[PDB]
Amino acid sequence: MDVLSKGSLKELLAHLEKTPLEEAISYRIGTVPYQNVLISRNEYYNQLYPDTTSLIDGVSREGQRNVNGLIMSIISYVVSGSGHYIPNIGFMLLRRSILDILTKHDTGLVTNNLNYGIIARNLTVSKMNCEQRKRMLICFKLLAYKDGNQNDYEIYLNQNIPLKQIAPNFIPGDMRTVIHNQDQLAIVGIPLTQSTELSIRDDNAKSYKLGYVDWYNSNSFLRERSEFNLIRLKDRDTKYGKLNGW
Amino acid sequence: YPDADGNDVSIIFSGAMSHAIFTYAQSQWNKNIIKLDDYIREITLTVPKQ
Amino acid sequence: ANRATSAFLDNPHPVGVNYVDEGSRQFVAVAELLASKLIDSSRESDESNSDVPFVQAYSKFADDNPRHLRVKTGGKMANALTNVIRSYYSINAPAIVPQVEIDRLASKATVSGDMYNSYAIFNSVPIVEVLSPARTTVSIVGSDRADVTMLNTGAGAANITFNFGQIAETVILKGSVPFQLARLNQPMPAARFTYKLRPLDGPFIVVLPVGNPLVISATAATRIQVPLAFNKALVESGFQTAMNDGLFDIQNVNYYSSFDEFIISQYHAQDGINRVSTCVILGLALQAYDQMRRALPVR
Amino acid sequence: ANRATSAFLDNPHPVGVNYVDEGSRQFVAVAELLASKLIDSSRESDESNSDVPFVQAYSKFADDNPRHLRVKTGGKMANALTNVIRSYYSINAPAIVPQVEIDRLASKATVSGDMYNSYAIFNSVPIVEVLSPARTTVSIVGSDRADVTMLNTGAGAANITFNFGQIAETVILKGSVPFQLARLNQPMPAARFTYKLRPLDGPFIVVLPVGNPLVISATAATRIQVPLAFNKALVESGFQTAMNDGLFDIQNVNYYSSFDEFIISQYHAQDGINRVSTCVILGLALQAYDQMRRALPV
Amino acid sequence: ANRATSAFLDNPHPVGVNYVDEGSRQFVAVAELLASKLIDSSRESDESNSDVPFVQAYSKFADDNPRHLRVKTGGKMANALTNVIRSYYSINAPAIVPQVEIDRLASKATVSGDMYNSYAIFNSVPIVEVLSPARTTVSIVGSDRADVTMLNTGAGAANITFNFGQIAETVILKGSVPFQLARLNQPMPAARFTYKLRPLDGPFIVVLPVGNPLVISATAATRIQVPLAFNKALVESGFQTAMNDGLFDIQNVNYYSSFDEFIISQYHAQDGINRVSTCVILGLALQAYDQMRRALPV
Amino acid sequence: HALIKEDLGQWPVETGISLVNQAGVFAVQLANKLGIDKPFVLDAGSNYFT
């Protein structure tokens, strides 16, 4: 809910630096990602409404234990607000922040073999709005410059002309580009009636939209009560035990 | 002694009906004491959308 | 030997694994409480010929003041409840309700989400296995009251083995004519009309004579922990409404006549002790579903 | 070829046409509401240690105060409710209660006689016909759970046709042994224990192998629109009470075991929609009767 | 001649003879009233955020205050209620509860009623005997809905005698195929599907043709005087709980599936008029036991 | 010998007149005496000694 309200590249990057990977992942099994299902939308139809599940719905789904699974969960969190279920990630990765997973080499994750075309297909980029595509391209560009695969990012953009039109105009190394960026990446925001939408993505997105006004006021006190005497998880000092399976 | 929510629980020797009548009355009034944020939400539902 | 089993105990489909945490149990409990208030407000509105009691209850339920041009279906809470009911029934049902919605709806009232305050008695009789020799014929018919018809054709009396499982608490057997029943490796008592058995005690052998068919009527009672708001009359009515509306039309699932058979069939699975908890939650949701549709009718 | 049918579905008798209008519907709603207060007045009397709550409840229901030398009967409303129930069951029953008396009793409490603001589930399984070929025996037993016993003494497998009507919403079939069932002009699937089917789909063919008998248990669910004050448990008890008291004792009518069978049998008549509305109003009247007579036995 | 009887009608065991006086009857009514307030209070406490209604309800019921560490046994009222239920079932039960303790518990509340104020309808069908000739075979299965399957393999039509006793008010007979039934030494009518009979009319003869078997389904209604607070749904569930908790495990006793079967079996016996009085008291005790246990599981 | 007594006052009742009527009148008086007739929150966390 907080990641969706960020409307600037500066605010989105600042949030990712503060947020650990734990809130990008989820601990709920969910269902299989791609599946033709019939859902009940009684506000419109007596019959069951056909739809296809995906990873863009704000609902947890099963993900494999690999770098592709971790990347998909991070992007889904940015573009949808809810991550995926990757089993037993490990303490060392969960304590790192999202941006360091995307842009730093000390995390212990190899991302040199990522295929951008396959990730977009798996994330169903076709059923994404303008804001979501921009956020996905920000994550792609950060990974591309981290591993030196800047050429592959350009090849992917050239193959997808519509994405090339709305691509972000920032260079990950430079800071002048981030300061002067003028993109609008906000998905949720204060304005809508308490009604139901037909699609799973549209219904879940509207649920975040209607709950943002209430979340703006109620989160302050309830949060502060939780970590009144709690040590911050992000970059927590430890004995640096091990990283298993990566 | 303090409770989990921050209230103060007084344990005293007292009568049965005095305890029953007084404590029941507390429950009835407390049913209508709500947070300000919840009151604002109730108000907003009874006014036009603007 | 021949093997006979009750139809409703054959291959119970897996149940949902989502919306079973404490937050989701609170959401179902909140929905059931608010659905009941809706039906009481509907009676008060009819008696007083005023829409004030209904508007107040619908606003508390749907968080949206009713409008003439639109259609009243329960709002977002109804959408979440209906789709959550589907998820409980089968694993193949999708999980589409986000958890920001569940937490938001769980806060509309204060209720204890514990589902183990009280108990309930379910009457479905489980006959897992009836074993008969080659000369005999055995037929099992019924779910609430199982009727077992046995006919002996061979020369001598036959022994029929009854297996009632290990979950049912008590089982009462009645015969059209007096019959002989005993345990494994136990003397046969004199012929009686009715027997009271403990299914945990062991397999039972029935001496079947060669003369005339013997019909044994079985009735069982089992105890399953349920919340204090559980009401069997409402849950059963909610079960049929869900089946009629098509909420249970998922691929590769089994269909049951009543909620009695559904919960008992799921209990007798390999991991039934964990499946019953989900079924009880589905039962409370169905009771909330029943009260909600009866208050808001759609033809 | 033989055909078999459910016993309770045979020859539904015509129902009454009086006491269906708005004023009469509100009389039944008032009678139900006031009779309910009569039962609850007993619990109030226990808590209050006095008979005043009961006296108030009976005075409103009967327009007269209770007496100790008289057996409490209910007065005009009890007489009106009893006679109105008689008219509903048969068209041969007289309509004795005047309209003016109905309007006066309908003004006692504020209600709306809307009988279409809710629904109920009725579990009577309708088997209109079962068509079987020669050398095949078919027996239909039961009304709430219908058991069909099928025996094939012939040389080969037989095809038996089921017709569940066009009214029931769902029917679930559970067999003693796995069997094959399919719609007309459809291929047969693998043998399964349970089938869920919509009677509107069409006649169903079940394959009967030669050997031991096959028994199929049928459970059906039907949705009928009823008033919000409807309670199936009270209606069913009222049906048995009225039958015992002889309110249904009239020439040239049929007798049913339960109200579930009565309403479904009438719904499957030549024009069953005309009789469903009257049957539901009879249900509310019976629910009032059960409460009134249990509080005031006679 | 062959004789076939219902299973549940065979050998009703003697019912206990203690705790049937006016003072003991008052105790059961008070226990039922206090238990109902307990379960209603428990629901309100769960609905609300505070536990006041349950604390007062349990203090009145158990004569002590609830504790978070000790278990909620229900007090001496729960102990007395459990033991009197044991005594009511069989005459061989101990019945060692002091009468002074019963009177003390009966003074907690006062009840404005008795055990004969109202009535209830019981649906078990009594089939005392079915008499058949040498060649025919008759099987009786069922208690809520009796199903009598008769098959004729002789030369010609046979006559089957039905005895429904003299206690039941009305019995409804339905058949798989139309059949003829008439009273003893009376002409037979044309074949019909459903018959309505008064068991006191006399033994009934049924014409059984040679050929396919005939199955007759019987439903009966009996009226028994009960207190106004009687509820069959609560009594039936209380009956099952008592059996599961082993309150009925006594030597030389009979076991029944439902309280409806138990009360009809006792009524259809010599000195059955005196037995139903104690069975009604036991039924109301089971109502209190159900409500008390569902609020305080152990 | 010692004992503990709860003194809630003496409220006589007439046999002929209705008991519920008298109880209701006495209820208003009792609520005023206990100070629970009007909305209130108990503030008894300060009356202690260490």
Coordinates of N, CA and C in Angstrom, one line a residue, chain B residues 31, chain C residues 26 30 33 60 106-113, chain E residues 45-50:
Chain B
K31 N -19.7 0.1 25.2 CA -20.1 -0.3 23.9 C -20.3 0.9 23.0
Chain C
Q26 N -11.6 -14.3 11.8 CA -12.3 -13.1 12.3 C -13.2 -12.6 11.2
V30 N -17.1 -12.0 11.6 CA -17.7 -10.7 11.5 C -18.8 -10.7 10.5
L33 N -22.0 -12.3 12.0 CA -22.7 -11.4 12.9 C -23.4 -10.3 12.2
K60 N -23.8 -0.7 7.5 CA -22.8 -1.3 8.3 C -22.3 -2.5 7.6
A106 N -12.4 -7.5 8.6 CA -12.4 -8.1 9.9 C -12.5 -7.1 11.0
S107 N -12.3 -5.8 10.7 CA -12.3 -4.8 11.8 C -13.7 -4.1 11.9
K108 N -14.7 -4.6 11.2 CA -16.0 -3.9 11.3 C -16.8 -4.3 12.5
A109 N -16.3 -5.3 13.3 CA -17.0 -5.7 14.5 C -15.9 -6.4 15.4
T110 N -16.2 -6.5 16.7 CA -15.4 -7.2 17.6 C -16.0 -8.5 18.0
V111 N -15.3 -9.6 17.6 CA -15.8 -11.0 17.8 C -14.5 -11.8 18.0
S112 N -14.7 -12.8 18.9 CA -13.7 -13.8 19.1 C -13.7 -14.8 17.9
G113 N -12.6 -14.9 17.2 CA -12.6 -15.8 16.0 C -12.3 -17.3 16.4
Chain E
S45 N -21.6 -12.7 25.3 CA -20.2 -12.4 25.7 C -19.3 -12.6 24.5
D46 N -19.5 -13.6 23.7 CA -18.7 -13.8 22.5 C -18.9 -12.6 21.5
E47 N -20.1 -12.2 21.4 CA -20.4 -11.1 20.5 C -19.8 -9.8 21.0
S48 N -19.9 -9.5 22.3 CA -19.3 -8.3 22.9 C -17.9 -8.5 23.2
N49 N -17.3 -7.5 23.9 CA -15.9 -7.5 24.3 C -15.7 -7.8 25.8
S50 N -16.8 -8.0 26.5 CA -16.8 -8.1 28.0 C -17.6 -9.4 28.3

